[PDB]
Amino acid sequence: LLDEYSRQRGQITAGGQLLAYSVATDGRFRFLRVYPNPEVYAPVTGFYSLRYSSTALERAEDPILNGSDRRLFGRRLADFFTGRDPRGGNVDTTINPRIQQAGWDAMQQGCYGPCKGAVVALEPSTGKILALVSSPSYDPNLLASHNPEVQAQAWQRLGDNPASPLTNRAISETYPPGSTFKVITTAAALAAGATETEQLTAAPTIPLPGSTAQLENYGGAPCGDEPTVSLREAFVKSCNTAFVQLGIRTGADALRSMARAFGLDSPPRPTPLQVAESTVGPIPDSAALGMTSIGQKDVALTPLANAEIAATIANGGITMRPYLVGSLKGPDLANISTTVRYQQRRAVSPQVAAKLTELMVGAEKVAQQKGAIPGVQIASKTGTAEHGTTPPHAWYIAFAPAQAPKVAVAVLVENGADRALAAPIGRAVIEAALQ
Ligand SMILES: *C(=O)[C@H]([C@@H](C)O)[C@H]1CC(SCCNC=N)=C(C(=O)O)N1
């Protein structure tokens, strides 16, 4: 450890701003790692610690940041030959500081006090991760201390915190998607040949086949005041029974297949950070299928996966591979690597994506309007999700402008559902993006 602290570790950057850098000190270990906006960027930087090693981008891009990367070998030779103090390379992220800060701020004020959860912003046409927010977060300056006791105390406080602030909730945790998963049930039906004008039950209640279990609308009220409702109408008003009926009519295999087409049960590519796998679940019976259709049973998504669903629809049906690192530099600022955007797969036809967009623009209009942006059209799906064996989660997925999208977001507020919170958070992130 002594020698690797005698060489100046390189910088983690966002928008030409520093997220992590190293300062020359009088310490036995010469360089101290500094995080100037610590809690906000901790999901992106991770920590770099004498006692506890590294996480996130400190760990992923460790060869570049410490200067040991093969691609940096010439610079290291030239410096030693010339007498120059050596320095590691730089990692330039895809994070937009304005959007990251707006996601964080909105999370710290959006639950009459701080929310627990995650915000992800994506650029639909490129796959760039524009923001990666987790709350509560922690201060990596605490683990950068050269004092063993300060590090050990911080490590212990963090690990005993029931809110688990070390966890990057945007990419490492999976949550039931609830109402947001109607986007997938809808996509599956549209692809199988159903249309927006198709008629579905408006009944307040629906039996689940092969069980005494029963599903209901919110909170026992009929979708319309008519016998049935159109698919568009049930989508925009987020009726449950209609979708239980739609999904079972569509069948398990079509639902599974659309779920995989949208990245579920599909091993995620590193960003370079590892992303937990999302799942539609086994769907072992028809009771399960009705429950899967409205985002429950065994469906579990990372906030990132849910932002990608929105980004895929925004991008005309094509999924761009999400990435966090735009380019790697050497100590001179010479380009070592530039990331090139990659089309992962087509999930749905331009037609189905267009249809889903219309429905989502309708769902946004029906929704609570706090934080709406004048002259900007937003396509969205709000929702709640039940979990465990408890207050439901609050979700918002969206993209904007709906006509030619520049940004897609997912907002998850753990336990945030009322009986509103997620959507204004989403819209502040969008607004910051479109500035
Ligand atoms: C979706 O999962 C839920 C639940 C019944 O399963 C329903 C209830 C709500 S919450 C209302 C939030 N309004 C908006 N901004 C919705 C919905 O998102 O409309 N779906």
Contact 361, 377 (CB under 8 A): yes
Which of 384, 386, 413, 427, when mutated, tests ligand 1's pocket best, judged by the most ligand atoms within 8 Å of its CB?
Answer: 384
CA distances for 328 relative to 55, 69, 78, 321, 332, angstroms: 18, 11, 19, 18, 11
Distance 395 CA to ligand 1 centre (A): 9
3-state secondary structure of 411: strand
Distance 123 CA to ligand 1 centre (A): 26
Alpha carbons 296 and 303: distance in angstroms, whole number? 15
* Annotated resolution, angstroms: 2.2
- Pairing state between β 12-14 and 90-93: parallel
- 150 membership: H or E segment, kind and range: helix 148-160
Contact 185, 255 (CB under 8 A): yes
The CATH number of 1-93+139-161+324-338 is 3.90.1310.10
Distance 62 CA to ligand 1 centre (A): 43
Ligand 1 binding pocket includes 416 (Cβ within 6 Å): no
Q: How do the domains of the chain map onto residue ranges?
A: 1-93+139-161+324-338, 94-135+174-323+342-435
- Residue with CA nearest ligand 1 atom 16: 383
Peptide bond before residue 165 is cis, with ω within 30 degrees of 0: no
Alpha carbons 343 and 70: distance in angstroms, whole number? 28
Atom of ligand 1 nearest to the CA of 383: 18
Alpha carbons 42 and 138: distance in angstroms, whole number? 7
Number of residues in the chain: 435
3-state secondary structure of 58: helix
- 28 membership: H or E segment, kind and range: none
> First-to-last CA distance in the chain?
44
Query: Domain 94-135+174-323+342-435's class?
Result: alpha beta
Distance 220 CA to ligand 1 centre (A): 13
Q: What is the Cα 325 distance to its own chain's centre?
A: 16
Distance 256 CA to ligand 1 centre (A): 23
Ligand 1 binding pocket includes 245 (Cβ within 6 Å): no
Ligand 1 binding pocket includes 271 (Cβ within 6 Å): no
Alpha carbons 185 and 418: distance in angstroms, whole number? 24
Atom of ligand 1 nearest to the CA of 418: 10
Alpha carbons 152 and 377: distance in angstroms, whole number? 49
In this structure, the number of other CB atoms found within 10 A of the CB of residue 52 comes to: 14
The structure was resolved experimentally with X-ray
Atom of ligand 1 nearest to the CA of 368: 15
Sequence-distant (≥ 6) Cβ neighbours of residue 50 within 8 angstroms: 1, 5, 29, 146, 148, 151
Ligand 1 binding pocket includes 223 (Cβ within 6 Å): no
DSSP for residue 30: -
- Residue with CA nearest ligand 1 atom 11: 383
Alpha carbons 383 and 177: distance in angstroms, whole number? 8
Atom of ligand 1 nearest to the CA of 363: 19
Written as one string, the DSSP assignment of 375-406 is: T---EEEEEEE-----PPEEEEEEEESTTS-S
Catalytic residues: 179
Ligand 1 binding pocket includes 295 (Cβ within 6 Å): yes
Which of 179, 244, 397, when mutated, tests ligand 1's pocket best, judged by the most ligand atoms within 8 Å of its CB?
Answer: 179
CA distances for 262 relative to 130, 296, 318, 351, 420, angstroms: 20, 17, 10, 16, 27
Atom of ligand 1 nearest to the CA of 382: 18
Alpha carbons 78 and 83: distance in angstroms, whole number? 8
